[PDB]
Amino acid sequence: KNRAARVRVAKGNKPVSYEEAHAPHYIAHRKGWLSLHTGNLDGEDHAAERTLEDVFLRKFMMGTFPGCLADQIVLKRRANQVDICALVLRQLPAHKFYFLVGYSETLLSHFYKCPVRLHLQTVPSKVVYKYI
Amino acid sequence: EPWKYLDSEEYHNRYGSRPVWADYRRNHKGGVPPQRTRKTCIRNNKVAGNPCPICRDHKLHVDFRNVKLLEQFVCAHTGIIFHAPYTGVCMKQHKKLTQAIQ
C-alpha cells in the first residue's frame, strides 16, 4: 500500500482540507502547485537553489505565525520578486499581524537579497473540504 | 446560638432544603452493612476518613434548642428517632442526638 502524502481514513470525524484530501497522483489534475517558479522548465537553471529557498520559507512562516496558518502557503516568484500567499486564522490581534508582516518581509529581503512581499488572507476558521 | 446556622445562607447553599445526611454514604465491605456505625468520628482532635453528617460539618451543633436540626433526625410520619445506620451518624453523635431530642 502507498503511504505517501495520503491522509488516511479515520471514522468520518477527521476534517481534511482540499489540499490534504487529494493524493499525489491528483497533482496537475485536481490540485495545482503550491510554488510557481521557472526553475524546473526545460533548459532552465537553478532548480536546486529555488527549491532550497522554498523549504526554508515554509519553515520560517510556520514559526513566525505559530498556530495561525489555516493552510499551506503559496510561493510565487516573478523576476526577482518573491510573493508569499498564506491563509491565516483570525486568532491574533490585527496590529500584531502588521508587525509580523513588516518583520518577516524585511528579514527575508535582506536574507535572500530580493524584494519579498507577504499576502495574508484571513479566514474565520479552517475550511473543511470533506470529513473522512 | 446554634439555631442561627440552619437559617444562614451558608447552610442553604451547602444543604438546600434536604436533610444534612442526604448526601452521605458509608464505606464498607459487602452489600449488607454492619449493624452499628463507627463509635466516633473524632478522636483527640483527629477526624476519621469519611466523617459522618454531623461530624463533617463543625458548625452543626447537637443542642436541644436547635430543633430544626433535630427534626431532620426524627420521622415526620411515625415520630420515631432513626437508628444510626439510617442516617450514618456515628454512635457518639447518635446518643447525643437522642438525648437532645428527648
Binding site: 519553515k59 500584531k96 | 445526611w21 449488607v32 452493612p33 411515625t78
Partner: protein
C-alpha cells in the same frame, strides 16, 4: 541542522506510537508545548513594541528593549508556576458517585438523554445503568470482535420511566444508544398519593418472580437494589418487594415495568364496580375516608362478601403472621433508601 527539524504534530505521532503493530493486537501521554507561549516572548527577554508589549504607553511611542536579568528570572519562574498549576489542574478531577459497588456500572447515573429533533430537552430526566456486559464476538475483521451491551433505565421521578438496551463496539456508544432509545419507551406508572403503588402486585416474568407490597409513608424502599434504582426514577418512595427465581436483570426490569404499568387505580375500581372506594387507616380510627367515587351512576347492590375468601395465599407472606422465625438477614438496619 535547521533542515532536519520536524513539526510538533509529527514529533508526537512518532513518540506516542499509538498507531503500531503492538498497539492494535497488544504510558506515554501527549502534551502541548505552545500552550503558554505568547508570541514575542523569548529566553533573552527582549521587548517588542506591538508584539509582546504595548505599542504606545502613556502617549509615548515605545522602542525596542530588553528585560534585566532579575526581571527575566521572575518571568521565567512565573511561567514555571503556571505550568505546574496547569499540571495540577490536569491532576485535579471531579469524582462521580459509585453505584452498587465501586468497580461496577450498575446504579451509575450517566446524565439526561440528548435533546430531541426540535430542541426537546430532557433535563428533568435522569439515566441509570443496570447491567453492562462486555462480550467478544466472532467476525472476520479481527477474528474476534468486541461488543458492549448496556441496559439502562430513565425516569423523571414523577411517574414517567422507561428502559432500553443499547449495543455497540465502544461502551460510550452503547450508553448513548440505550439512553436515547429508552426516552422513546416511557411508561407512566400510577402512584397512590404520589409515594407508593396502588395495591400489592405479584407476577412471574419468565423465571423471575416479583412480589411487591403497598406500604405506608416512611417505610422506604426495601427492595432489590435494581428495584430501588428504578423506583427512584419512577418516584415511588415507600414499597417492599421480593425477587425469587432467576435474577436476570432484563427479566427483572421487564417484569417490573409490566406489573407497575398494569396496576388498577382506586378510581378505576370505583368505575368498574360502580361502588364507593373507602379507606380505613388505623391512625385515623373508624373514620371512613372516601378515596374514589364512581364517575357515573352509584350502584345500590352491595358487593358480595363471602364468609371465607378463596384467595390464593403465599406461604412467604403468611409464614410471618404464623409466628415462624425469620432469617437472621431479615429486617436488618440499613441506610436510608
Amino acid at each position: 541542522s535547521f533542515f532536519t527539524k520536524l513539526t510538533a504534530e509529527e514529533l508526537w505521532k512518532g513518540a506516542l506510537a499509538e498507531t503500531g503493530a503492538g498497539a492494535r493486537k497488544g504510558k506515554k501521554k501527549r502534551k502541548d508545548l505552545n500552550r503558554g507561549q505568547i508570541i514575542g516572548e523569548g529566553r533573552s527577554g527582549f521587548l517588542w513594541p506591538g508584539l509582546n508589549v504595548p505599542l504606545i504607553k502613556s502617549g509615548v511611542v515605545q522602542n525596542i528593549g530588553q528585560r534585566s536579568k532579575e526581571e527575566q528570572q521572575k518571568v521565567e519562574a512565573t511561567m514555571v508556576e503556571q505550568r505546574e498549576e496547569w499540571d495540577r489542574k490536569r491532576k485535579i478531577k471531579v469524582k462521580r458517585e459509585r453505584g452498587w459497588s465501586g468497580n461496577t456500572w450498575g446504579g451509575v447515573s450517566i446524565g439526561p438523554p440528548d435533546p430531541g429533533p426540535n430542541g426537546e430537552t430532557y433535563e428533568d430526566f435522569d439515566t441509570r445503568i443496570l447491567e453492562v456486559r462486555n462480550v467478544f464476538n466472532m467476525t472476520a475483521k479481527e477474528g474476534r470482535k468486541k461488543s458492549v451491551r448496556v441496559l439502562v433505565a430513565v425516569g423523571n421521578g414523577n411517574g414517567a420511566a422507561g428502559f432500553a438496551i443499547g449495543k455497540a463496539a465502544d461502551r460510550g456508544d452503547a450508553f448513548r444508544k440505550a439512553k436515547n432509545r429508552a426516552i422513546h419507551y416511557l411508561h407512566y406508572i400510577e402512584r397512590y398519593e404520589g409515594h407508593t403503588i396502588f395495591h400489592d402486585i405479584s407476577l412471574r416474568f419468565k423465571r423471575t418472580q416479583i412480589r411487591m407490597k403497598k406500604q405506608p409513608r416512611g417505610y422506604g424502599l426495601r427492595c432489590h437494589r435494581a428495584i430501588i434504582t428504578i423506583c427512584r426514577l419512577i418516584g415511588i418512595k415507600d414499597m417492599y418487594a421480593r425477587v425469587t427465581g432467576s435474577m436476570n436483570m432484563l427479566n427483572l426490569t421487564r417484569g417490573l415495568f409490566h406489573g407497575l404499568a398494569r396496576q388498577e387505580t382506586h378510581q378505576h375500581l370505583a368505575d368498574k364496580k360502580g361502588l364507593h372506594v373507602v379507606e380505613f387507616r388505623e391512625e385515623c380510627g373508624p373514620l371512613p375516608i372516601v378515596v374514589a367515587s364512581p364517575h357515573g351512576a352509584l350502584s345500590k347492590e352491595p358487593e358480595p362478601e363471602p364468609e371465607v375468601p378463596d384467595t390464593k395465599l403465599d406461604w412467604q407472606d403468611v409464614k410471618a403472621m404464623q409466628g415462624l422465625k425469620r432469617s437472621v438477614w431479615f429486617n436488618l438496619k440499613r441506610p436510608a433508601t
